[PDB]
Amino acid sequence: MTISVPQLDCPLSRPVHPEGERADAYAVEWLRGVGLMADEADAAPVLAVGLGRLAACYVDENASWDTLAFMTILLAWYAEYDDRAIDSTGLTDAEVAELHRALGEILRDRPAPDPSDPVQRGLADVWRTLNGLASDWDRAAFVDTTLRYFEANRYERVNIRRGIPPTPSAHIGMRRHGGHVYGMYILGAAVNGYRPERRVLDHAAVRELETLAANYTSWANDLHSFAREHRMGQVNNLVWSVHHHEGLTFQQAADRVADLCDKELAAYLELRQTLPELGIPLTGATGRHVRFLEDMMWSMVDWS
Identify which of residues 41 and 266 has a Cβ nearer to its own copies in the complex: 266
Contact indicator for 115, 121 with CB cutoff of 8 Å: yes
Residue 36 found at the interface with its own copies (CB under 8 A): no
Residue 166 found at the interface with Mg ion (CB under 5 A): no
Minimum distance of its own copies from residue 52's CB (angstroms):
30
Number of other residues whose CB lies within 10 A of the CB of residue 293 = 24
Q: Which of residues 19-78 bind Mg ion (CB under 5 A)?
A: none
Q: Which does 212 bind (CB under 5 to 8 A by kind): its own copies, Mg ion, none?
A: its own copies
Minimum distance of its own copies from residue 171's CB (angstroms):
8
Residue 151 found at the interface with its own copies (CB under 8 A): yes
Residue 202 found at the interface with its own copies (CB under 8 A): yes
Residue 86 found at the interface with Mg ion (CB under 5 A): yes
- Given the rule CB under 5 A, which of 79-87, 127-135, 141-149, 164-172 is the region that contacts Mg ion? 79-87
Rounded Cα gap, residues 194 and 105, in angstroms: 27
Is 304 annotated as a binding-site member? no
Rounded to 10 degrees, the C-alpha dihedral 58/62/65/71 comes to -10
Minimum distance of Mg ion from residue 78's CB (angstroms):
9
Is 229 annotated as a binding-site member? yes
Contacts with its own copies by CB under 8 A: the residue count is: 40
Q: Which does 167 bind (CB under 5 to 8 A by kind): Mg ion, its own copies, none?
A: its own copies
What residue ranges bind its own copies (CB under 8 A)? Answer: 144, 147-149, 151-152, 154-155, 158-159, 166-170, 173-174, 177, 202-205, 207-209, 211-212, 215, 245, 263-264, 266-268, 270-271, 274, 277-279
Annotation: binding site? 82, 221, 225, 229
